[PDB]
């Protein structure tokens, strides 16, 4: 996730990415959009 250089948003966004990663939510989202919805079997 990108922000303009020095933006005050960067720190919080980074911690949010880590929290989502560690809660398993990023994995859940990838499976939702890639595999759960796959059309090839």
């Amino acid at each position: 996730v990108a922000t303009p250089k020095g933006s005050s948003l960067r720190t919080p966004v980074n911690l949010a990415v880590l929290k989502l990663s560690e809660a398993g939510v990023l994995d859940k989202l990838k499976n939702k959009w890639w595999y759960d919805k796959g059309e090839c079997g």
């Binding site: 990108a2 922000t3 303009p4 948003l9 919080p12 989502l20 959009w33």
Partner: protein, 96 residues
């Protein structure tokens, strides 16, 4: 203030929803990065507007003019506050 999120129409990251023609704002879109934006915004406590990058590009610097295009350019020139997209972390981008 509402945070302007630049992103790109790239499946399955951001896609036009069924019935988008009669929907407005963030409701027009669905996908991995739409869901991710909602999660990030919730954790960080901001409201936001998804905006598809005007030129449809990720972002590169013109070797001649040195001007950045794409989502990278939207951030560099102050047109967006954040990019939530399949945007690769690279050396030349990390410089700007």
């Amino acid at each position: 203030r509402t945070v302007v999120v630049t992103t790109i129409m790239e499946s399955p990251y951001v896609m036009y929803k069924k019935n988008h023609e009669m929907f407005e704002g963030n409701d027009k879109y669905e996908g991995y990065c739409v869901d991710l934006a909602s999660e990030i915004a919730k954790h960080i406590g901001i409201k936001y507007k998804i905006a598809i990058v005007p030129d449809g590009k990720y972002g590169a610097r013109d070797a001649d003019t040195k001007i950045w295009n794409g989502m990278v350019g939207e951030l560099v020139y102050g047109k967006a506050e954040i990019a939530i997209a399949p945007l690769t972390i690279t050396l030349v981008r990390e410089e700007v």
